[PDB]
Amino acid sequence: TPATTXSWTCITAGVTVXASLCPXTKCXSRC
């Protein structure tokens, strides 16, 4: 796995948590 320096993996994994609680996350962002 050519996972250089925090690529897609780092992106998706982190994004997911924020959109979980992070304010503004359920306001149409996921609904």
From Swiss-Prot:
- Record PTM 2,3-didehydroalanine (Ser), positions in chain: S7
Modifications after synthesis and translation: Maturation of lantibiotics involves the enzymatic conversion of Thr, and Ser into dehydrated AA and the formation of thioether bonds with cysteine. This is followed by membrane translocation and cleavage of the modified precursor.
Q: Where is this cross-link: Beta-methyllanthionine (Thr-Cys)?
A: X24-C27, X28-C31
The covalently linked position for Lanthionine (Ser-Cys), per the record, is X6-C10, X18-C22
Q: Superkingdom of the source?
A: Bacteria
Chain positions with (Z)-2,3-didehydrobutyrine modification: T1, T4, T5, T12, T16, T25
Which subcellular locations apply to this protein? Secreted
Q: What's this protein's function?
A: Lanthionine-containing peptide antibiotic (lantibiotic) active on Gram-positive bacteria. The bactericidal activity of lantibiotics is based on depolarization of energized bacterial cytoplasmic membranes, initiated by the formation of aqueous transmembrane pores. When present individually, LchA2 exhibits activity towards B.subtilis L1 (IC(50)=30 uM), Rhodococcus sp. SS2 (IC(50)=16.6 uM), M.luteus B1314 (IC(50)=2.6 uM), B.megaterium VKM41 (IC(50)=2 uM), S.aureus 209p (IC(50)=20 uM), B.pumilus 2001, B.globigii I, B.amyloliquefaciens I, M.smegmatis 1171 and M.phlei 1291.
Protein name stated in the entry: Lantibiotic lichenicidin VK21 A2
Q: Which organism is it from?
A: Bacillus licheniformis
Q: Which gene encodes it?
A: lchA2
